[PDB]
Amino acid sequence: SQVEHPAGGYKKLFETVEELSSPLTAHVTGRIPLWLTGSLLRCGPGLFEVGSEPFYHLFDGQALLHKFDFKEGHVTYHRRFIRTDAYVRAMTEKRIVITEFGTCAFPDSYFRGVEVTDNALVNIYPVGEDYYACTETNFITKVNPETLETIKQVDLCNYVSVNGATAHPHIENDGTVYNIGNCFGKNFSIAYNIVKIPPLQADKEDPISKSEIVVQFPCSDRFKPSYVHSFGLTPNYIVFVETPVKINLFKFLSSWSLWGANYMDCFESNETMGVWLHIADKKRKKYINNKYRTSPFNLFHHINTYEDHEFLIVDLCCWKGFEFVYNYLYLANLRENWEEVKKNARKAPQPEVRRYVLPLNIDKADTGKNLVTLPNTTATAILCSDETIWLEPEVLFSGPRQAFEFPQINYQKYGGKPYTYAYGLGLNHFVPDRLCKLNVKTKETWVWQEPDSYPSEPIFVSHPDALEEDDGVVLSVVVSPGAGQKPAYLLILNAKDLSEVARAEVEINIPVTFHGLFKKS
Amino acid sequence: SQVEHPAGGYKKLFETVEELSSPLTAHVTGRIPLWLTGSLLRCGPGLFEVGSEPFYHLFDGQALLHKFDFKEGHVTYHRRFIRTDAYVRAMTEKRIVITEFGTCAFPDSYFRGVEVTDNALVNIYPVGEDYYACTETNFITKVNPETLETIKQVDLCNYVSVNGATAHPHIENDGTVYNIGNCFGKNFSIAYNIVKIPPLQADKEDPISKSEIVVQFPCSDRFKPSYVHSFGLTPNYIVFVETPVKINLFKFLSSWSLWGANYMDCFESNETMGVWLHIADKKRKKYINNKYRTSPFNLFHHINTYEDHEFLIVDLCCWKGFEFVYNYLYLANLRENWEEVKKNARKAPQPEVRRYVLPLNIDKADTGKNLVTLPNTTATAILCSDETIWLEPEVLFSGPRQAFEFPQINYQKYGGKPYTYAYGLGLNHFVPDRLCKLNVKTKETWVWQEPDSYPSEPIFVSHPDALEEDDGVVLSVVVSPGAGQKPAYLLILNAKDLSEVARAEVEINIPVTFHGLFKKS
Ligand SMILES: [Fe+2]
Ligand SMILES: [Fe+2]
């Protein structure tokens, strides 16, 4: 790493905090643009222990909903814990009641039904007129975006046939929400279903009640689904990537009744499988039977996806290797001293942004040849006798233990479409270190960074009279735990330069946050 | 391609030329450094047809030996065809007598012994006090470096047990020559032998007569060796890369006696095998049984190789895919018009410079983890249950149909050792387009280029009082067929800047040349 952090400020990203009864006024450095009048809503953990019972993993902490509101002249900050079953039961009983991702709860009997986690710390997104905080299970939580108050719990299994769903659904311009999850295939097998929730209608009834299944992807292993964090979507195509990080459902049903495990205990890695890629015709609702294959890696975040003549351009934030990257994300290890953090990540998967290019229409004549005839890429697709199609990427970004993660674009105008710029959070040995801009064509980058300060995902907000793709700002929440300073602040950067425009400073700490959403109010 | 060549000047790289009875004086532009007093010797084809019988492939043309001599104030140029059997028989009979790589000769009987090609057009290199021009067979040709006169033919099978050898042997500082070739393994199989020729001795007897076998690499396929263009060498290790381009010996013995084929007709591609990598202890003369594996690609030129703690850093000029790149190098297609050349290379393998990193000492405890713990690389090595080690590279250079090829370094001081800079020939859709410098650490590059001019491999000559790695010049022969101009000229660039220092211009054309050698006279 170019940059070191011997002071260990990043510890404060994983430290419990309390709620606010009502919003704080933020002190403002610089000038806020007058056009920017909305609400930045983000999610993340906020309570990392229940008394003397600690949560162990990064994705175990109880969900905390954050809001930076730019209404009138000032900026305000507010935060409330989401009154989930996981939270409400824990506060009631002064203990950990619901098993989280990596923290297993124990009884204080008569067992009767597994209590799948409710803890929606990962993300928030809009369905119709409403907003839903979520995790990666079937339970999503309706919230009030004005007040941050918890409205309702929704069980997705009541409407669609899926076991869970990602916290990275795609939202179309008309409001239609797409998402992917595990299901049971028609013949004693596992598969992946694409869920479609339509936009609100004149009759005004709940859009979720009109949820449906578009298509079903098959599973490489009959009784083991891969882990799915997100997927790709274009106007005509749906793209799903099957990684070697498999879920071993066997283990959780065994240990639940017998010993007592958690979610992380079910994960295993398929050594010989590599990475399978899948395409579906979105409109015809067909799975296109094209056996795209490539070498092993973990994938959490798609960056963007789009069509180019008879090809799909697929940009991904990868991690080279089949070992589960989440292994490296226990809070005990993230709260280590800097020297020990770097040591711990030495044998970790190596991050790399990759452009994969999938030919849509294959022909047997070109068996044994590179099919990617596009002029401006070095990505490769080889047609074999297997009838499998072996892929090689065009690398866009690669730094030793430096990850371009939590990717974001101008999603409203360019999501699913040809594009040039992507923005992301820099991870220095897993510690969020800096903010990054990237030209996906030229590979040129820009970096914002300051010492002893640890920012969140950079969300792009378009200029209402934008002429270019990068015409707008980037919001990021920044934690600066240095001595004689403001614990944290919201950062606002000009998306062109990546230069600083303003700051909304606060007198209290903010923990790590994962994903969010800007609401143009 | 950024650069186009609609004029089609590159045609002149594949046009027959005659010899010179005696050297020409070159006209000099700029100032030649006073320290540079030696001989640049290069090889390549020079006769592309015998009357009305044409040679078809790039590597069929009859060998032509070139010399740029910087002796006293002036520069001189000379060239002679190498009096090989292939050449001598052809001139005698006014026809193609010996089957070349891609051009098959036909009878004008009683067959008795295959006549393997003598045509040493690829390269030249020194053994003891002598110099040997070579191809990729067992026949190498001794030449006079002062006069360019043909001295003798040498059959390597007379001394060592090998079927052939590469035109890319490694020469150590003490003069010892290492090289690799196909052999017959001890049990009815094929293998690869490392040949070692020692330096000249006090007794003054021929070093070749003291040739020996160091070690033997095994072959992935029992009856099919891969194609081997070059290999890697460090002070302690020998590195060999086994590609999916296999030789099908069956075919040549069948067609020779029956129909009548050539060398290119035996090549086939192993779809499912990928690329196997091999290491040997140079000193103990052992093959290290480590099953390094990775995805398919063609490899012709190693760039450099060196040791870093318990790791081998391996830099390669790759071509993504298992199809044989030589398919794309018939003279008929290289003499096409520019638009057709680009079309022909659309489905070709994509060039890419890659850094592969091989761990020397593997431990079972780390099975399923990334073993490459070095700080300044994104290359990966995964230990499996197979006990195979799956590799991912750190990409150093990647341009659409733009190849960094014919790589060269400051080989005397840094070959086999840690290094920073490498120099190469830019290939625009296979047409040699430009010259390149590359920082293998930072990836920063420099480019020299001028319109309607097509250069050769850039050879590095060190400054006698060098303080840095790039302290020296780069020689390249350049063909500028534009109207109202000097057909060709030798280019001399400052290796730091890649800026032009001088030119030795000539009034006659020079065809393509492959590899060479600077002789500090
Ligand atoms: Fe995520
Ligand atoms: Fe070569």
Short mmCIF file of N, CA, C and O in Angstrom, two decimals, chain A residues 345-446:
data_model
loop_
_atom_site.label_atom_id
_atom_site.label_comp_id
_atom_site.label_asym_id
_atom_site.label_seq_id
_atom_site.Cartn_x
_atom_site.Cartn_y
_atom_site.Cartn_z
N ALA A 345 -4.34 -10.02 5.21
CA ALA A 345 -4.84 -9.99 3.84
C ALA A 345 -3.80 -10.41 2.80
O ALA A 345 -4.07 -10.33 1.60
N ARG A 346 -2.64 -10.89 3.25
CA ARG A 346 -1.56 -11.26 2.32
C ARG A 346 -1.91 -12.44 1.43
O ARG A 346 -1.51 -12.48 0.27
N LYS A 347 -2.67 -13.38 1.97
CA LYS A 347 -3.04 -14.58 1.23
C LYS A 347 -4.49 -14.48 0.75
O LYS A 347 -5.07 -15.47 0.29
N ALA A 348 -5.06 -13.28 0.82
CA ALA A 348 -6.43 -13.06 0.41
C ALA A 348 -6.54 -13.00 -1.11
O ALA A 348 -5.56 -12.76 -1.80
N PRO A 349 -7.76 -13.24 -1.63
CA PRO A 349 -8.03 -13.00 -3.04
C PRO A 349 -7.66 -11.57 -3.46
O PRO A 349 -7.80 -10.63 -2.68
N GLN A 350 -7.19 -11.43 -4.70
CA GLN A 350 -6.72 -10.15 -5.19
C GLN A 350 -7.81 -9.48 -6.02
O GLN A 350 -8.33 -10.08 -6.96
N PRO A 351 -8.17 -8.23 -5.68
CA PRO A 351 -9.24 -7.56 -6.41
C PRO A 351 -8.80 -7.12 -7.79
O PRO A 351 -7.63 -6.79 -8.00
N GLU A 352 -9.75 -7.13 -8.73
CA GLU A 352 -9.49 -6.70 -10.10
C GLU A 352 -10.78 -6.40 -10.85
O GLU A 352 -11.68 -7.23 -10.90
N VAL A 353 -10.85 -5.21 -11.45
CA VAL A 353 -11.98 -4.86 -12.31
C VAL A 353 -11.76 -5.47 -13.69
O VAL A 353 -10.70 -5.30 -14.28
N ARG A 354 -12.77 -6.16 -14.20
CA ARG A 354 -12.63 -6.88 -15.45
C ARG A 354 -13.81 -6.63 -16.37
O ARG A 354 -14.95 -6.60 -15.93
N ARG A 355 -13.50 -6.47 -17.65
CA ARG A 355 -14.52 -6.37 -18.69
C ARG A 355 -14.60 -7.71 -19.43
O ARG A 355 -13.67 -8.09 -20.14
N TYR A 356 -15.71 -8.42 -19.23
CA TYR A 356 -16.00 -9.65 -19.97
C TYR A 356 -16.97 -9.34 -21.12
O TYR A 356 -17.89 -8.54 -20.96
N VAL A 357 -16.74 -9.97 -22.27
CA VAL A 357 -17.53 -9.71 -23.48
C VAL A 357 -18.10 -11.02 -24.01
O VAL A 357 -17.36 -11.91 -24.43
N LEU A 358 -19.43 -11.13 -24.01
CA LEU A 358 -20.12 -12.37 -24.38
C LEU A 358 -20.79 -12.25 -25.76
O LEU A 358 -21.67 -11.41 -25.95
N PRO A 359 -20.37 -13.09 -26.72
CA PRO A 359 -21.06 -13.06 -28.01
C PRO A 359 -22.46 -13.64 -27.91
O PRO A 359 -22.66 -14.69 -27.30
N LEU A 360 -23.43 -12.94 -28.50
CA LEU A 360 -24.84 -13.33 -28.41
C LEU A 360 -25.20 -14.45 -29.37
O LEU A 360 -25.98 -15.34 -29.02
N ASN A 361 -24.66 -14.41 -30.58
CA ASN A 361 -25.01 -15.39 -31.60
C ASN A 361 -23.78 -16.17 -32.08
O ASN A 361 -22.98 -15.68 -32.88
N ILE A 362 -23.64 -17.40 -31.58
CA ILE A 362 -22.49 -18.25 -31.89
C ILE A 362 -22.75 -19.13 -33.12
O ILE A 362 -23.88 -19.56 -33.35
N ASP A 363 -21.71 -19.38 -33.91
CA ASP A 363 -21.81 -20.21 -35.11
C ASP A 363 -20.72 -21.28 -35.13
O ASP A 363 -19.55 -20.97 -34.89
N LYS A 364 -21.10 -22.51 -35.45
CA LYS A 364 -20.18 -23.65 -35.35
C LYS A 364 -18.97 -23.54 -36.27
O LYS A 364 -17.89 -24.05 -35.94
N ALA A 365 -19.14 -22.88 -37.41
CA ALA A 365 -18.03 -22.64 -38.34
C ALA A 365 -16.81 -22.07 -37.61
O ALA A 365 -15.68 -22.48 -37.89
N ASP A 366 -17.04 -21.16 -36.67
CA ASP A 366 -15.96 -20.51 -35.94
C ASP A 366 -15.57 -21.26 -34.67
O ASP A 366 -15.11 -20.65 -33.71
N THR A 367 -15.75 -22.58 -34.68
CA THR A 367 -15.33 -23.40 -33.55
C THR A 367 -13.81 -23.43 -33.46
O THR A 367 -13.14 -23.83 -34.41
N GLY A 368 -13.28 -22.97 -32.33
CA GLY A 368 -11.84 -22.92 -32.09
C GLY A 368 -11.23 -21.55 -32.32
O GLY A 368 -10.01 -21.41 -32.27
N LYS A 369 -12.07 -20.55 -32.57
CA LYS A 369 -11.62 -19.19 -32.89
C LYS A 369 -12.14 -18.19 -31.86
O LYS A 369 -13.09 -18.46 -31.13
N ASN A 370 -11.50 -17.02 -31.81
CA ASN A 370 -11.96 -15.91 -30.97
C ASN A 370 -13.13 -15.20 -31.65
O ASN A 370 -12.99 -14.71 -32.77
N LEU A 371 -14.26 -15.15 -30.96
CA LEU A 371 -15.50 -14.64 -31.55
C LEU A 371 -15.70 -13.14 -31.33
O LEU A 371 -16.53 -12.52 -32.00
N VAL A 372 -14.93 -12.55 -30.41
CA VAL A 372 -15.09 -11.14 -30.07
C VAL A 372 -14.41 -10.26 -31.12
O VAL A 372 -13.24 -9.90 -31.00
N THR A 373 -15.18 -9.91 -32.15
CA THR A 373 -14.67 -9.16 -33.29
C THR A 373 -14.76 -7.63 -33.13
O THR A 373 -14.35 -6.88 -34.02
N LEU A 374 -15.29 -7.17 -31.99
CA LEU A 374 -15.36 -5.74 -31.70
C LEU A 374 -13.96 -5.13 -31.77
O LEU A 374 -12.97 -5.79 -31.46
N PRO A 375 -13.87 -3.86 -32.18
CA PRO A 375 -12.58 -3.21 -32.40
C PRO A 375 -11.85 -2.70 -31.14
O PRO A 375 -10.62 -2.66 -31.14
N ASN A 376 -12.60 -2.32 -30.10
CA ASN A 376 -12.02 -1.60 -28.97
C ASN A 376 -11.96 -2.39 -27.66
O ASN A 376 -12.18 -1.85 -26.58
N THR A 377 -11.63 -3.67 -27.76
CA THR A 377 -11.50 -4.51 -26.57
C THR A 377 -10.45 -5.59 -26.80
O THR A 377 -10.17 -5.98 -27.93
N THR A 378 -9.87 -6.06 -25.70
CA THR A 378 -8.94 -7.16 -25.74
C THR A 378 -9.54 -8.40 -25.07
O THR A 378 -8.85 -9.40 -24.88
N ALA A 379 -10.82 -8.32 -24.74
CA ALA A 379 -11.54 -9.47 -24.20
C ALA A 379 -11.73 -10.51 -25.30
O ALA A 379 -11.78 -10.19 -26.48
N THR A 380 -11.84 -11.77 -24.87
CA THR A 380 -11.78 -12.92 -25.77
C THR A 380 -12.92 -13.90 -25.47
O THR A 380 -13.33 -14.05 -24.32
N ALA A 381 -13.43 -14.55 -26.51
CA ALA A 381 -14.43 -15.61 -26.36
C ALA A 381 -14.16 -16.73 -27.36
O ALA A 381 -14.28 -16.53 -28.56
N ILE A 382 -13.78 -17.90 -26.85
CA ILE A 382 -13.35 -19.01 -27.69
C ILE A 382 -14.43 -20.09 -27.74
O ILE A 382 -14.84 -20.60 -26.70
N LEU A 383 -14.88 -20.43 -28.95
CA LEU A 383 -15.88 -21.48 -29.14
C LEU A 383 -15.19 -22.83 -29.21
O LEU A 383 -14.30 -23.03 -30.02
N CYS A 384 -15.62 -23.76 -28.35
CA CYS A 384 -14.98 -25.06 -28.25
C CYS A 384 -15.83 -26.17 -28.87
O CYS A 384 -16.94 -25.92 -29.36
N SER A 385 -15.30 -27.39 -28.86
CA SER A 385 -16.03 -28.58 -29.30
C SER A 385 -17.04 -29.01 -28.24
O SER A 385 -18.11 -29.51 -28.57
N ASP A 386 -16.69 -28.79 -26.97
CA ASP A 386 -17.64 -28.88 -25.85
C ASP A 386 -18.92 -28.11 -26.13
O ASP A 386 -19.96 -28.41 -25.55
N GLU A 387 -18.82 -27.10 -26.99
CA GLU A 387 -19.89 -26.15 -27.22
C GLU A 387 -19.94 -25.14 -26.06
O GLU A 387 -20.85 -24.31 -25.97
N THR A 388 -18.94 -25.21 -25.17
CA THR A 388 -18.70 -24.19 -24.16
C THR A 388 -17.92 -23.06 -24.79
O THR A 388 -17.21 -23.26 -25.78
N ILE A 389 -18.04 -21.88 -24.20
CA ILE A 389 -17.42 -20.67 -24.72
C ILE A 389 -16.48 -20.09 -23.66
O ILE A 389 -16.93 -19.51 -22.67
N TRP A 390 -15.18 -20.25 -23.88
CA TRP A 390 -14.19 -19.85 -22.88
C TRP A 390 -13.81 -18.40 -22.97
O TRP A 390 -13.30 -17.95 -24.00
N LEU A 391 -13.99 -17.69 -21.86
CA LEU A 391 -13.83 -16.24 -21.82
C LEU A 391 -12.55 -15.78 -21.15
O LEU A 391 -12.09 -16.39 -20.18
N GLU A 392 -11.97 -14.70 -21.69
CA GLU A 392 -10.87 -13.97 -21.06
C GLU A 392 -11.28 -12.50 -20.97
O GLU A 392 -11.89 -11.97 -21.90
N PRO A 393 -10.96 -11.84 -19.85
CA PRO A 393 -11.40 -10.45 -19.71
C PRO A 393 -10.41 -9.45 -20.28
O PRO A 393 -9.28 -9.81 -20.62
N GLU A 394 -10.86 -8.21 -20.40
CA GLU A 394 -9.99 -7.06 -20.59
C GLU A 394 -9.94 -6.38 -19.22
O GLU A 394 -10.94 -5.85 -18.75
N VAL A 395 -8.77 -6.42 -18.58
CA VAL A 395 -8.60 -5.81 -17.26
C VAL A 395 -8.68 -4.29 -17.37
O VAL A 395 -8.07 -3.70 -18.25
N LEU A 396 -9.43 -3.67 -16.47
CA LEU A 396 -9.61 -2.22 -16.46
C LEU A 396 -8.90 -1.54 -15.29
O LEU A 396 -8.53 -0.37 -15.38
N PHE A 397 -8.71 -2.28 -14.20
CA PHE A 397 -8.06 -1.73 -13.02
C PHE A 397 -7.49 -2.85 -12.16
O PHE A 397 -8.18 -3.83 -11.88
N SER A 398 -6.23 -2.70 -11.74
CA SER A 398 -5.56 -3.71 -10.91
C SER A 398 -4.46 -3.11 -10.03
O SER A 398 -3.42 -2.67 -10.53
N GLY A 399 -4.70 -3.10 -8.72
CA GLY A 399 -3.70 -2.65 -7.74
C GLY A 399 -3.52 -3.66 -6.61
O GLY A 399 -4.50 -4.21 -6.12
N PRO A 400 -2.26 -3.90 -6.19
CA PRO A 400 -2.01 -4.88 -5.13
C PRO A 400 -2.79 -4.61 -3.86
O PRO A 400 -2.49 -3.66 -3.14
N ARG A 401 -3.81 -5.43 -3.59
CA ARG A 401 -4.61 -5.33 -2.37
C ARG A 401 -5.36 -4.00 -2.31
O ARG A 401 -5.77 -3.55 -1.24
N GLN A 402 -5.52 -3.37 -3.48
CA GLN A 402 -6.25 -2.12 -3.62
C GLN A 402 -7.44 -2.44 -4.48
O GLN A 402 -7.29 -2.78 -5.65
N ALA A 403 -8.63 -2.33 -3.90
CA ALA A 403 -9.85 -2.70 -4.61
C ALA A 403 -10.64 -1.46 -5.03
O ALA A 403 -10.79 -0.52 -4.26
N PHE A 404 -11.12 -1.48 -6.27
CA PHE A 404 -12.15 -0.56 -6.74
C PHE A 404 -13.49 -1.25 -6.47
O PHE A 404 -13.93 -2.10 -7.24
N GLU A 405 -14.13 -0.91 -5.35
CA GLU A 405 -15.34 -1.61 -4.93
C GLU A 405 -16.51 -0.65 -4.72
O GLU A 405 -16.36 0.56 -4.86
N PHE A 406 -17.68 -1.21 -4.39
CA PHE A 406 -18.92 -0.44 -4.23
C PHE A 406 -19.15 0.47 -5.44
O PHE A 406 -19.33 1.68 -5.28
N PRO A 407 -19.15 -0.11 -6.65
CA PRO A 407 -19.16 0.69 -7.87
C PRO A 407 -20.48 1.39 -8.09
O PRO A 407 -21.54 0.88 -7.69
N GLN A 408 -20.41 2.56 -8.71
CA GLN A 408 -21.59 3.37 -9.00
C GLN A 408 -21.38 4.11 -10.32
O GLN A 408 -20.26 4.45 -10.67
N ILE A 409 -22.47 4.35 -11.04
CA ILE A 409 -22.43 5.11 -12.28
C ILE A 409 -23.55 6.15 -12.29
O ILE A 409 -24.27 6.28 -11.29
N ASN A 410 -23.68 6.89 -13.39
CA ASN A 410 -24.87 7.68 -13.65
C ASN A 410 -25.93 6.70 -14.12
O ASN A 410 -26.15 6.52 -15.31
N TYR A 411 -26.58 6.05 -13.16
CA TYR A 411 -27.41 4.88 -13.42
C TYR A 411 -28.72 5.22 -14.14
O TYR A 411 -29.24 4.39 -14.89
N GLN A 412 -29.24 6.41 -13.91
CA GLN A 412 -30.52 6.81 -14.49
C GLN A 412 -30.45 6.90 -16.00
O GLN A 412 -31.34 6.40 -16.69
N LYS A 413 -29.39 7.51 -16.52
CA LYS A 413 -29.24 7.71 -17.96
C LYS A 413 -28.40 6.64 -18.66
O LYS A 413 -28.57 6.42 -19.87
N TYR A 414 -27.52 5.96 -17.92
CA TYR A 414 -26.55 5.02 -18.52
C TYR A 414 -26.59 3.59 -18.00
O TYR A 414 -25.95 2.71 -18.57
N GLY A 415 -27.32 3.34 -16.92
CA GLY A 415 -27.46 1.98 -16.42
C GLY A 415 -28.07 1.12 -17.50
O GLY A 415 -29.09 1.49 -18.08
N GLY A 416 -27.43 0.00 -17.81
CA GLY A 416 -27.91 -0.91 -18.85
C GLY A 416 -27.51 -0.50 -20.26
O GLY A 416 -27.85 -1.18 -21.24
N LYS A 417 -26.76 0.60 -20.36
CA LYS A 417 -26.45 1.22 -21.64
C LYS A 417 -24.96 1.48 -21.77
O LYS A 417 -24.22 1.39 -20.79
N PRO A 418 -24.49 1.78 -23.00
CA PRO A 418 -23.10 2.16 -23.17
C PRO A 418 -22.74 3.37 -22.32
O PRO A 418 -23.52 4.32 -22.23
N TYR A 419 -21.55 3.32 -21.72
CA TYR A 419 -21.12 4.32 -20.76
C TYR A 419 -19.60 4.39 -20.70
O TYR A 419 -18.90 3.55 -21.27
N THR A 420 -19.09 5.40 -20.00
CA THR A 420 -17.66 5.72 -19.96
C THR A 420 -17.08 5.76 -18.54
O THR A 420 -15.98 5.25 -18.30
N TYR A 421 -17.81 6.38 -17.61
CA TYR A 421 -17.29 6.63 -16.27
C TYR A 421 -17.96 5.78 -15.19
O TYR A 421 -19.17 5.56 -15.21
N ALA A 422 -17.16 5.30 -14.25
CA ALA A 422 -17.66 4.62 -13.06
C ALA A 422 -16.90 5.10 -11.83
O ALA A 422 -15.71 5.42 -11.90
N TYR A 423 -17.61 5.16 -10.71
CA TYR A 423 -17.08 5.70 -9.46
C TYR A 423 -17.10 4.60 -8.42
O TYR A 423 -17.96 3.71 -8.46
N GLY A 424 -16.15 4.63 -7.49
CA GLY A 424 -16.06 3.57 -6.50
C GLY A 424 -15.30 3.90 -5.24
O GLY A 424 -14.66 4.95 -5.15
N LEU A 425 -15.38 2.99 -4.28
CA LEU A 425 -14.68 3.10 -3.01
C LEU A 425 -13.38 2.29 -3.06
O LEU A 425 -13.39 1.10 -3.39
N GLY A 426 -12.27 2.94 -2.74
CA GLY A 426 -10.97 2.27 -2.71
C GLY A 426 -10.79 1.52 -1.41
O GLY A 426 -10.97 2.09 -0.34
N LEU A 427 -10.45 0.23 -1.50
CA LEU A 427 -10.18 -0.59 -0.32
C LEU A 427 -8.71 -0.94 -0.21
O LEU A 427 -8.18 -1.71 -1.01
N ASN A 428 -8.06 -0.36 0.79
CA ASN A 428 -6.67 -0.65 1.10
C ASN A 428 -6.63 -1.79 2.11
O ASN A 428 -6.90 -1.58 3.29
N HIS A 429 -6.29 -2.98 1.62
CA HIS A 429 -6.35 -4.21 2.42
C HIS A 429 -7.66 -4.33 3.16
O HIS A 429 -7.68 -4.61 4.36
N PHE A 430 -8.76 -4.11 2.44
CA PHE A 430 -10.14 -4.15 2.97
C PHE A 430 -10.59 -2.89 3.74
O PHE A 430 -11.79 -2.66 3.88
N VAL A 431 -9.65 -2.09 4.23
CA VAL A 431 -10.00 -0.82 4.86
C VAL A 431 -10.36 0.20 3.77
O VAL A 431 -9.56 0.42 2.86
N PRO A 432 -11.55 0.82 3.87
CA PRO A 432 -11.95 1.86 2.92
C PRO A 432 -11.09 3.12 3.06
O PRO A 432 -11.13 3.80 4.08
N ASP A 433 -10.33 3.40 2.01
CA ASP A 433 -9.16 4.26 2.07
C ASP A 433 -9.30 5.57 1.29
O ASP A 433 -8.71 6.58 1.66
N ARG A 434 -10.08 5.54 0.21
CA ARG A 434 -10.10 6.62 -0.77
C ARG A 434 -11.35 6.49 -1.65
O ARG A 434 -12.10 5.51 -1.53
N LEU A 435 -11.57 7.48 -2.52
CA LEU A 435 -12.63 7.43 -3.54
C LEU A 435 -12.02 7.49 -4.93
O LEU A 435 -11.01 8.18 -5.14
N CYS A 436 -12.63 6.80 -5.89
CA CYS A 436 -12.06 6.64 -7.23
C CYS A 436 -13.05 6.91 -8.34
O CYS A 436 -14.23 6.56 -8.23
N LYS A 437 -12.55 7.52 -9.41
CA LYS A 437 -13.26 7.62 -10.68
C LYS A 437 -12.47 6.79 -11.70
O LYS A 437 -11.25 6.68 -11.60
N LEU A 438 -13.18 6.22 -12.67
CA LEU A 438 -12.55 5.37 -13.69
C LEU A 438 -13.18 5.53 -15.07
O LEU A 438 -14.39 5.40 -15.22
N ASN A 439 -12.35 5.80 -16.08
CA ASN A 439 -12.79 5.73 -17.47
C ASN A 439 -12.64 4.30 -17.95
O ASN A 439 -11.54 3.80 -18.14
N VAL A 440 -13.77 3.63 -18.17
CA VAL A 440 -13.76 2.23 -18.58
C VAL A 440 -13.21 2.00 -20.00
O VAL A 440 -12.93 0.86 -20.37
N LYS A 441 -13.07 3.06 -20.79
CA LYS A 441 -12.51 2.95 -22.14
C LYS A 441 -11.00 3.17 -22.13
O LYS A 441 -10.24 2.36 -22.64
N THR A 442 -10.58 4.28 -21.52
CA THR A 442 -9.17 4.68 -21.51
C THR A 442 -8.41 4.15 -20.29
O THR A 442 -7.18 4.18 -20.28
N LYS A 443 -9.14 3.71 -19.27
CA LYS A 443 -8.57 3.19 -18.00
C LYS A 443 -8.00 4.28 -17.08
O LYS A 443 -7.65 3.98 -15.94
N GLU A 444 -7.92 5.52 -17.56
CA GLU A 444 -7.51 6.66 -16.75
C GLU A 444 -8.36 6.74 -15.48
O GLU A 444 -9.57 6.51 -15.54
N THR A 445 -7.73 7.05 -14.35
CA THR A 445 -8.45 7.19 -13.08
C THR A 445 -8.18 8.53 -12.41
O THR A 445 -7.24 9.24 -12.76
N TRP A 446 -9.03 8.85 -11.44
CA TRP A 446 -8.84 9.99 -10.56
C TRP A 446 -9.07 9.50 -9.17
O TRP A 446 -9.83 8.55 -8.97
#
